[PDB]
Structure formats: C-alpha cells, structure tokens
Amino acid sequence: DFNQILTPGDVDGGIINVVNEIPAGSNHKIEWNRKLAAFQLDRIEPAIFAKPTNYGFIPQTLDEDGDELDVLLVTEQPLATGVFLEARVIGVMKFVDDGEVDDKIVCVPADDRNNGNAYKTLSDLPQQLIKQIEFHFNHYKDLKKAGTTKVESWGGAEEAKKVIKESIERWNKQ
Amino acid sequence: FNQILTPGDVDGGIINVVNEIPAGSNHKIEWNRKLAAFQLDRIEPAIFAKPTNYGFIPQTLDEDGDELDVLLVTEQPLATGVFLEARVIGVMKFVDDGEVDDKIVCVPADDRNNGNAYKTLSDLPQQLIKQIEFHFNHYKDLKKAGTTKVESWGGAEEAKKVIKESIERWNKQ
Amino acid sequence: DFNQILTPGDVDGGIINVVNEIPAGSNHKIEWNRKLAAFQLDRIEPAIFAKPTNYGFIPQTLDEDGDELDVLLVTEQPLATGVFLEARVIGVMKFVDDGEVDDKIVCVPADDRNNGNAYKTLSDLPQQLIKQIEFHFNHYKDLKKAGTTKVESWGGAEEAKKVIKESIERWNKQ
Amino acid sequence: DFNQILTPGDVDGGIINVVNEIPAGSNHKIEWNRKLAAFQLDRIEPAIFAKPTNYGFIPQTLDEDGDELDVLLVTEQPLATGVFLEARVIGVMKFVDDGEVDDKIVCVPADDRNNGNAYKTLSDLPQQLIKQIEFHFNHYKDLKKAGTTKVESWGGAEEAKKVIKESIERWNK
Amino acid sequence: DFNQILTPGDVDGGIINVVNEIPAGSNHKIEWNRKLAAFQLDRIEPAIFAKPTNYGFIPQTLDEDGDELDVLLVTEQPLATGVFLEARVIGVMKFVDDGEVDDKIVCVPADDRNNGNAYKTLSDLPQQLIKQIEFHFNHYKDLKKAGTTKVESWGGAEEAKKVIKESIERWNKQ
Amino acid sequence: DFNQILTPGDVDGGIINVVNEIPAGSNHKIEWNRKLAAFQLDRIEPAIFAKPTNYGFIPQTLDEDGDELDVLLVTEQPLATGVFLEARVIGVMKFVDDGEVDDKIVCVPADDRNNGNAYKTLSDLPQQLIKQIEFHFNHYKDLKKAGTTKVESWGGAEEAKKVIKESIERWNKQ
Ligand SMILES: [Ca+2]
Ligand SMILES: [Ca+2]
Ligand SMILES: [Ca+2]
Ligand SMILES: [Ca+2]
Ligand SMILES: [Ca+2]
Ligand SMILES: [Ca+2]
Ligand SMILES: [Cl-]
Ligand SMILES: [Cl-]
Ligand SMILES: [Cl-]
Ligand SMILES: [Cl-]
Ligand SMILES: [Cl-]
Ligand SMILES: [Cl-]
Ligand SMILES: [Cl-]
User: Fold this and answer.
1) Is residue D171 classed exposed, middle or buried when 0-12, 13-18 and 19+ CB atoms within 10 A define those classes?
2) Interchain CB contacts (distance < 8 Å): E and F
3) Which residues bind substrate (chains A, C, E, F)?
4) What are the φ/ψ torsions at residue D171 (nearest 5 degrees)?
5) Would you tell me how many other CB atoms lie within 10 Å of the CB of residue E15?
6) How far away is chain F from the Cα of E52, in angstroms, using its nearest Cα?
7) D146 touches chain B (CB under 8 A)
8) Domains (ranges, CATH) in chain C?
C-alpha cells in the first residue's frame, strides 16, 4: 500500500514521490486501486490513443475525481507499472474531464543521468511535445463521445506546487 | 489477491482475473498463493511462448488444488501482476498429466480498441483457436510428448459452470 | 524498380500487388521515390500520429497527387519497408488531403494463415478499427494546420476496384 | 539482383555469402524472388510458428524446390530482411518438405565479437535449441495438413559443404 | 515483503532464492526499498550503460554496502521487476564500488528448458560475455566520475557460496 | 546505387542527403557496400556497444583513406537500414580511428514534426547525450583495441560543412 508507506515528499522543494501506473506508449488504462492496494486494468483504450507520457499519481493526495492527483512523467524510455520514484515538478496541465477538475502534474525523474537533468522547467521540453500531449488529452475519449475533455492551460512549477498542496489538504480532510 | 478480490460477477459473465504471464513470453510465471508473490517457475522453450496472456481467477480451485487458469486474449500483452474485470467467452477443456486443468477464455470487459468485438468463441478467428489448441497440445513435447490434451472448446455457459464448480472447491477448503 | 517489375495484379479478382512503405506503428513518413527508385524518409511525424496500419502503394497506378495509389494494409504485426506482396482488396477510404483526392485502398495479405483469411470485407474488421483509422487520417496534420484533411466515406471491394481501374488508366496515359 | 554480383563465397573454407530473408521471431514468410529481384511476403504464418532463427539463402545456388539453397542463420538479435553477410558454416539440417528435399545450411555470422565466435559446430549450440528448430520444421505446416515435413538428420560442416557444392552445380546447369 | 516470506534458499546445494530488480537491457536503476517494501527507481542511468544482465538480490542477506547481496541473473530474454525465482549459482563477480565491497553472485534460472540448463559454471558462458559484464561494471559511473569501480576477479560457485553465507551471517547479526 | 542516384545535396544550406545504415540501438555493424550496391552485415559488435544514434553516410563523399563520410543521425525512434533522407547538419564529431581521420557529421532529419525541429546546433541537444556519444566512440573497440579511438573535439555546423566539402573534393578526384 503506497499511500501509507509513502508520503507526497518535498512539495516545497519540488521533489515529490510518484507511483507509476501506465508506461508511455501503452493503450492499457491501468489505475492504482486504493481499496485493494493493487493495479487494475480498467479498460483497453484505442491503440491510436496510447499514452504520450508515463502516467502516475502522487501518494496521499486527493483531486476532484476522488482519486489521487495524476502525474505526467516524461522519460526517454517507458517506466513499468508499479515502481515509484522521486520526481522533479516542472509544471502542471490544467485539465477538465467530464465536468470535473483533473489537473496533471508534469514531472521528470529527479535524478536523470540519461539527459543529465536537462528538463528543469516546462519550456525546456520541445514545444511540439506539449502540443502532442495537449492533443491527446483533448481527444482521447472522442471515439465514445467528443467534447468532454479540455486542456485549459499549462502552468509552471509554482502553480503546480499550489495544486499539489490543495490535493494534500483534501487527503488530510479524508 | 485471494483475500481482496472475489471471483466477481460469475452469473453475469464478468469475472476478476489476475494476469501472470504476458502473451508472447516464454517465462512460466505463477502466483504463489502461500507467499503472495509472483514466481518464475522456469524458462520454457522459446518456440512455446504463450499464445495469449495467462492468468487466474481468485478464490477458485481445480480438483487437484490448482488455481483456475485464464487465457486472456488482447492485441498487446498485459504485464504480470495487473488485475482486471474480464468477459467470459468460453472454456478450453484441458487435461494435463491426467488432471483436469481447464482454462477459462476471456477478453477485457471494457475493450475500446476493438469495441468489445469478441463475445463468444465464434467471434474469434477459428485459426486463432487452432493455434491455442496446438500450443497446449504440444508445449511439453521437448520433455515428454503425449501428456497434455485439449479435449473440447465450450461456450460461456459451460465456462460459468466450471467457474462455479471451482468456487465450491475453494469454499470447501 | 517496382513499377517495372510489378503490374497492379489481378484487379478484377481483387488480388493486387502492393509495395509496403511504412510499417504499422511507425511515425516515419517513408515514400517510394519513383525517380530515384529508392525509399525516402520524407519527415518525422508526431509520435501520437503513428500510422494505424501499414502504408503502401500499388505499382503502375497514378492518383491525383501524382504518386501511385496508396494502400492501407492491415496486419497483426508490422511489415518492413520495401517488401511487396499479393493483397486482397477489401475496401477503399475516400479521402481529400489539402485540396486533392488521395483515396487509399484497404487491403490484407491474400494468404493469411495466422487468422485463416478472416478478413474479406470491411464488415469483417472491427468497426472500432475503422473508426480509429478515420480519426487518424482526419487529424494527422492538425499540429501544423487543422481542417485540411477529410475522410469522405468508405466503400467496399467493388468501389475499390473502380478506383484502382481509374488509377491504372491515369498511369497508362501519363 | 543478389545472384548477379554475389557468389556463394569460400565454400571450401566454410565462409559463405548469405542473404537474409526473414528476421528471427517473425511470422512473415518472406522470400527473395529471383525473377523480379525483390523480397516478397508470400504469406502470414501462424504466430505460434514464428521462425526460430533468421532465414536466408545462398546466392547462385539451387535446391530441388527450384529456389536458392536455404540458410538457418543463428544470432542473438534478429537480422533485417535484405542484408547480406559472410557466414560461417557450422552444419546442415537435412529436410524433406512435402515430397521434396529442402535442406538448410546452419550458419552463424563469420565475425561475431559479441560472443567471440563461440559457435563453430552444431554441438557448440545448446542441444535444446537444435531440438526446438527440429520441432519447428517438423510442425510448421500442421495447421494446414500435418505429416508432410520431416527433419531427417543433422550433419556437420563437411556434409554441409557437400550439399552446398551440389547446389552450386544445379545453378550452373 | 520478500525478506520475510523468502529465505536465501538452498545455499549448500547452490540453488538460491533471487528477487529481480532490473530487467536486462534497462537503463533504469531500480532497487528494492526494504523500509517501504516497494521497488524504487533511484535514477535514470545513461542509455549507453543499460544493464548487461538482469539485476536482483538474495533475501535475508546483507553485504558491506548495507543492502542485500546483489545478483547478476543471465537469461536470454529480460525478466520483469518484482518476480522471484529459484536460481542456480554459477559464479561470483568480486567488486569494489567507491571503496565499499559489493560482490555480485552470478546466477541463471535453476530450471531453464530453453537452453536445457546449458550454463553450470562461468566457463560455460562466452568469455566475451564476461568481458562485457566486466567492462560495464568498470565504467558505468564514468560520466559522473571515473576510476571509482573495479571488478577485482571472477570466482566459481564455491567462492560464491562462501560470499552468500557471510552475507547471511551479516543479516542474522542485524 | 545510392552513390549514382543521390548527390550530397545542399551543403552550403546545411541540408544534405544521408543514407542510413544502422538503426540506433543495434549492435549489428551494417555498411553500404559500394562494390556490390547492397548493405552488408560486416560483424556483430559487443551488445554493450550498441550504436547510440543512427549511423549512416553521405553519398559521393570520401574520407582521406577512401572511407565514406560517416553520419551520426539523431532521432527519437530508430531509423531502418536502407532509407535515405534530407538531413540538417548540426555539427561534427572530430574523430581519429586507427591512426586515420574518421570524422562523423552530426545530423537530424531536416523535417522533424515530432520535436518541431528543436535541434539546430549541438548545444540544443542534451549535453549528456553528447557525452554518451563521446564515450561510445572512445571505447567501442576496447575489447580488442588495435589503434586509437579518440574523439578530438566537437565542431559546429560551419566546421562540419568544411569537412563535407573536403570529402566531396576527394570523391570527385577519384
Ligand atoms: Ca485522475
Ligand atoms: Ca489449473
Ligand atoms: Ca498519396
Ligand atoms: Ca527452400
Ligand atoms: Ca549492492
Ligand atoms: Ca569514415
Ligand atoms: Cl522500468
Ligand atoms: Cl499492461
Ligand atoms: Cl516484415
Ligand atoms: Cl540487422
Ligand atoms: Cl518476465
Ligand atoms: Cl552523470
Ligand atoms: Cl524507419
């Protein structure tokens, strides 16, 4: 159970703990199930909508959807389901999904000796990668029903820190 | 898994399945119930990579004390250790070393890549069935041939009866 | 040089010759360069728009873009660039790309002993696969400029044969 | 056209030229088409019968089936279709396919700095690998009709050289 | 938690229990976190230094570095993080990592029906494979700071058993 | 025959023609054989020395020894053997191999819509990627090293153009 052993980490310093759920490039919707302490394959997504980044969550946080706050974790090679890591916060994708706020914190591994910690801020990523992530989350439910998801904005690390802190308060309330 | 997960909605044909072996792997991985951990029992011959994902239904028992196995069919392989709700589409009636060792045939219950295209065994390519049958008829042949036999392919109602029988065995032990 | 060694094949019988350019799942836009008689990587596409099928062409055909008529070849595992095969015609995607007609013939290998020739008509494919292909071709240029590509409609094998015969005539008269 | 400028190579030295057709692990039956000078996907094979080695041919040879002599090329990672190499001859699989002889020369790359040229005879390979290759070629047409293929025996490099020389004579005539 | 459900196994018979941490070919440094009972991605390594074998540990053992004794597990295809297996001991790599002893037991799966248990000693492996493993561990920290790691020697199964028993005593005395 | 159909391209403009021989991540040493006009697997390299980038050459150029002028082509996903492309020159790895100059032009695809043409100079790349490439070429013959393998410096695109133009002159004189 990750939400009892692991804390959110050093939110003020931008180094947080993240549990990975979905390897980049997978069209398997995998989710940590808090009740069972296990990873569940909710569904198979359309192959054209494979995840453009690794997809994870922050332990001991609560968003508007009742689940832990989501993480877009960018690496060169995909991460397996179920490993956790310390990750550097570099921004936030403000996002609405079916009427509920479901923001996603953008992260890289805190210690990345493959790119030498090259991504320290959101605009260090190629602009075209941001556009692809934006397109993915704007459209990944379109084959069921279009127009229910909306990437609202991209925020820096300080706005991401504020989002994480609010999600921490929700967890502490519950 | 056998403490948190139940077999699920067997009457509705939507069961819980825990994946052990990704499709295409020649690693014989099994959930060790005594230790609550996944064990690589052995490396199989590469020519006998699993033709489908391979898993089990929690809280079920074969007649000989074995878990009730699941052949889970997907386009891309599933990792070891993920669980899912799965649609029962049939049963491979199977004998291994004289022991009944049936395998429930399943797909993910929510498949938005093919739009839940497979609901019965006849929805699958008959040639996929023949490959699965060949695999389980021969995968032990390099050690000793003739010890495994695919007896028949049953529909979803027969599969449900096999699941319910295995639920009873679990309950009684 | 495939346009000299290969004819279109048995168009009336629905078994044609197809030369593969792009493996399914690749975001590399590879095209047969008829002038040089070699395969050219035109550009890298966004990774979110990896090709949903193999992409190929029919020898000795001309569509309106001045290239050979395109083929969407559906297989379980991707086909390498530069291999040719006899393929069963199962339909056609009517398509307009940046002002011009650029229809694509939908094909499977003529001899498929993996699925036992399971796909003979478009209705044999999962509808959700067609919907994914439609979405891909409706959106794959959106990061440069949206609204320039349109999947007009889908036809069956006799409609596809008519398009092939029209492109054979354009080749002969070039 | 590989048969125009590529020769069979140093048959007496056991270092021959091989053109690869099928990557190890592929279920795509790809064949060099001599008349067109291009690689043709003849058919998709059952996924359970993916090739257990790379599959290639010797230029300017002819076996009894009318094509160039086949090569089983063993490597740790698959080779792409259409690459040629100098290969060390380590044995021959004597083979009958649907009535006619279709022997296959067993080779490794002549220059392997990953394993330090570890394989010089068939006995240097894991015996279980040979048994897997034999099973594959004994069964790969079974879903169409069983019993039409037979691995007759395995020979060493000298029998392989004799087979190659007979195939060079067929090409010349 | 592996250190409570698993013993080291049949050390005297050379068949020990091993828990896999890093799949061969991965540049993700994954470690079993004993305090959290979970696998942690410590850092991304340079891709040029992808692990040449699977990398794991023996439960209920301690080496000089304070972690469980390491294992180099050689397989034809990589093993996933988090699986455990009975492994045959075939050798030991004697190794110093920044002034600390950190030997690694060389193992293969005890039941290998793909190669028919072809590897029983180090001399059964290609000598070039050993040289590559040696190169890797002599150089994998070089982009940070070179000259801090040294493969000291390669021992057989009997020396490996002695190393295992010493690590069992260290664990027992903790 | 790529040396007859293709020219070096627009050297002054920095957009040249490149033929790919080796996919990134491959340990297969594949070379275009000018005598036969075909791609040859010269040898299997140690797996620990897989190519860190795609590896290719510029048509109609010669090193001072008669070697074709090599290309390090950087992409996110490996390119297949045998395709050619227009590529942007972004730098040069000055390199000495066995007592001879053996420079390698650093390139990216000229039209990269996955990263949005993010890389125009060497400094645009993560500097840790450069250090990994440097380590690779300094050490890839270490298992049996018969001569120098030394990266002498990293040059910009203007120095790279001078190297290309010198190699065009040698080719024309031959
Ligand atoms: Ca969420
Ligand atoms: Ca069973
Ligand atoms: Ca076109
Ligand atoms: Ca043959
Ligand atoms: Ca250690
Ligand atoms: Ca050179
Ligand atoms: Cl990972
Ligand atoms: Cl998965
Ligand atoms: Cl292919
Ligand atoms: Cl290759
Ligand atoms: Cl595995
Ligand atoms: Cl570093
Ligand atoms: Cl490619």
Assistant:
1) middle
2) 32
3) 29, 43, 55, 140
4) -60, -50
5) 15
6) 7
7) no
8) 1-174 (3.90.80.10)
